[PDB]
Amino acid sequence: DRFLREKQAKLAEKIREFNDARQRGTPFYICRDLADLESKSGDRHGPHIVEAYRAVMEMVGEHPDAGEAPRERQFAKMYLDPNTQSANALAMRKQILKGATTFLEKQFWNEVNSLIAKYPQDANLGGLPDVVSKIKAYIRLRIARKTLVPDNVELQQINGEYVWAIVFYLLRAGFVTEAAQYVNSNQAHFRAIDRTFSGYINSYASSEERRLKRQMQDRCMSEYNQRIRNAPEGSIDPFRMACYKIIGRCDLSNRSLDGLQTDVNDWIWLQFNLARETDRSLELAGESYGLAELQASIREIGLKHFPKTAAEDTNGSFGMFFYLQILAGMFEQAIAYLYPFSYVDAVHFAIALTYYGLLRPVDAASAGNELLSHNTRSMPQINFGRMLGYYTRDFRAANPAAAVDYLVLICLNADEAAGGQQAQAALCHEALRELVLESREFSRLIGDIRPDGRRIRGVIEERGPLIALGQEDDFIRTITLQAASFADDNGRTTDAVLLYHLAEDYDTVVSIVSRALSEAISLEIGEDPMRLIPVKPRVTNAEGQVEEAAPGSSLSLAAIDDPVELAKAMMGMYERDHMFWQKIREPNRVACSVLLQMADIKSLVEQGRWAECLDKIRALDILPLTARGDPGTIRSYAARFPSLAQPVAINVPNLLMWTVLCCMRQRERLAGGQNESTARLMMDELKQMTVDLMAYTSQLRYRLPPHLHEALARAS
């Protein structure tokens, strides 16, 4: 019972191809493929679901052999008009009955050819593929097997053939015209036993409503009530008593095939074949049986022969009642009935219906309601988007790439008939908005950066066509920015950097990499190094598998966890590419490059190399090292302190202190290992520097810490 994981993947990868097909515009048949998946799953309750798919296939016009499948949501306007006496409310109910009976007729017709192909020697068939040939043969087998009728009752024969069954089983198999043409081609015979009959069925097959004239219908009701309905038992051909109830819709209250060897699938075919949709603008004298009168019936079958919960049903026969409710168009109550028993299929079934516009979504405002919820007009609704939400929380961590595919399907109700074109699309966009904030998986979701780095397109913008204009850039940046605003304010610089770069605000990225670098150098010597929480990688396999990359293919695989290495990389790309370089403003780009040496300096002192470090500081040109001790040039160097950037200026106190330590240690190191006259002038110059910087910090009494000077002298 752990194929649920196995199955969700099979179903998931199909959503990937499903969504891919809507995107470009390639043809694709969702119910066809979902049914195939469910049939090759081995589910105990499988068949009933495979069948219900085939019903809505016929019900809608999803025919793969014809290549004709409806455009997205072809039925939305037609279904979701609340006015219950409208041209669209009626036109729906009618095609619900047409395609529902069409399948029940096809279902039997498939049961027939199968039975025939079982006895090629006992079902005598000519080379002719006549529809009446196969029914005749089917009727022959049904007697050879002794399953046509209980033996005792009397039938009516012509040429030995039982004519009434040849008509009945023609009506059952969806052939109405061919039954009438059989009555006409044999009018000589039919006139003998029932002359009135040929007039009715000819009126039947001629009307597209499969309904009779008023003289016919009243003449048929009478013919049926008088000498059949209350006549001697067993004397009337049960196929004629049946052919009458079909043709005339007689005894519309008692809809049972009493005389025949019939199964539930026949019982079903009748309850659908007898129903016709009247115009709401009339009083149905006789109480013409319609889709609602049928829907009410099925709703009573469940409370009688079926249970409510997953504990009450242990036989596993919930499949039938779901299939029953699908035929009746009660999609809103069926999917809710099924969700406990197979919460997997209840979704994927709810997916395929919404692609066509049959599932009534809950209006966006009240997303909080439970699964099943009723409208302000007592019309059922399902919380389609939220249903996916809960279903998402089983695989959203290991594979958000799949979760996004499922989550865009909130967009299906972006059609205007749902009442929200922007309103439902907003809840989808809102749903993705809080998905990205939940996970740090910014490398797959929103995108990644090359070494150039042109954006490696992220999934949410690969699936941008579904959400937005098709250019799909207005919403993409909007979620990228706000996500960054919550990474920089949570100090997740590695994230905030990645995001702010994608939104093409490269200057802000520089402000962060520098800030993290200013704090990296501002540390004391030998202290625990600064280390930052790296980014969520893109592709992940620890052992034995390398995918589309090696470490360093992109930053997502770089393992950057040190602000020195981060600032080095960004500035690497930014500097050697002139298109990025020119978008980063002067103070921030230089201020960064300063700290890039400063850290290189702090690492020279951590090492303890004095002469090299002092050349770095000399090249920075921040301090008056080359002053040679004339207060003139030193006063000029101190005047240029304001122009320094914040992330540098704060680390000057450390810089000044480091600079002396190199002048003092190389002065002491000169005393021993080193001619001597030139070593004395250096020794004096190095002592002049420590006295020059002494004055530098002194002029800036206001802009530098109070105790820098006194601690400066102590060590000079």
- How many alpha carbons fall within 13 Å on the CB side of residue 365? 2
Q: Is 12 exposed, middle or buried (0-12, 13-18, 19+ CB in 10 A)?
A: middle
Q: Is 333 exposed, middle or buried (0-12, 13-18, 19+ CB in 10 A)?
A: middle
Enclosing H/E stretch for 495: helix 493-502
Strand partners, 63: 68
Exposure string over 574-586, b if 16+ CB within 10 A, otherwise e: beeeeebeeebee
Contact 217, 241 (CB under 8 A): no
Helix (H, G, I), strand (E, B) or coil at 147: coil
The torsion angles phi and psi of 285, rounded to 5 degrees, stand at -60, 125
- For the chain, how are helix, strand and coil distributed in percent, rounded to 5? 60, 0, 35
Report DSSP state, residue 158. Answer: B
Tracing tokens 């109910």 back to the chain, one arrives at: 93
C-alpha to C-alpha distance for 49 and 349, rounded to whole angstroms = 9
C-alpha to C-alpha distance for 225 and 221, rounded to whole angstroms = 6
CA distances 218 to 224, 225, 247, 248, Å, are 10, 10, 12, 9
Q: Is 279 left (phi over 0), alpha (psi -120 to 50) or beta?
A: beta
C-alpha to C-alpha distance for 658 and 605, rounded to whole angstroms = 7
**Cα four-point dihedral sign 202, 207, 210, 212:** negative
C-alpha to C-alpha distance for 397 and 43, rounded to whole angstroms = 27
Contact 160, 236 (CB under 8 A): no
C-alpha to C-alpha distance for 658 and 141, rounded to whole angstroms = 105
Say if strands 380-382 and 455-457 run parallel, antiparallel, or are unpaired: unpaired
- How many alpha carbons fall within 13 Å on the CB side of residue 117? 6
Q: Is 683 exposed, middle or buried (0-12, 13-18, 19+ CB in 10 A)?
A: middle
In this structure, the dihedral spanned by the alpha carbons of residues 260, 261, 267 and 270, taken in order and rounded to 10 degrees, is -40
Helix (H, G, I), strand (E, B) or coil at 539: coil
Tracing tokens 């749902």 back to the chain, one arrives at: 418
Question: What end-to-end distance do the CA atoms of the chain give, in Å?
Answer: 78
Q: Which two tokens stand for residue 489?
A: 């304010």
CA distances 67 to 19, 28, 261, Å, are 19, 9, 38
Contact 625, 659 (CB under 8 A): yes
The experimental technique used to determine this model is X-ray
Strand extents, DSSP E, 526-649: none
Helix (H, G, I), strand (E, B) or coil at 27: coil
- How many alpha carbons fall within 13 Å on the CB side of residue 510? 27
CB atoms within 10 A of CB 118: 10
Q: Which two tokens stand for residue 586?
A: 């002067």
C-alpha to C-alpha distance for 645 and 591, rounded to whole angstroms = 6
Q: What is the resolution of this structure in A?
A: 3.3
C-alpha to C-alpha distance for 57 and 67, rounded to whole angstroms = 12
Enclosing H/E stretch for 168: helix 163-172
- Give the angle subtended at the CA of 64 by the CAs of 58 and 70, to the nearest 5°: 65
Helix (H, G, I), strand (E, B) or coil at 372: strand
Contact 520, 599 (CB under 8 A): yes
Which among 493, 500, 547 has a CA at the least distance from the CA of 518? 493
- The radius of gyration of the chain from alpha carbons, rounded to an integer in Å, stands at 41
Contact 313, 17 (CB under 8 A): no
C-alpha to C-alpha distance for 208 and 98, rounded to whole angstroms = 11
Q: Which two tokens stand for residue 549?
A: 């990359």
C-alpha to C-alpha distance for 451 and 192, rounded to whole angstroms = 92
Tracing tokens 């002092």 back to the chain, one arrives at: 614
Helix (H, G, I), strand (E, B) or coil at 708: helix
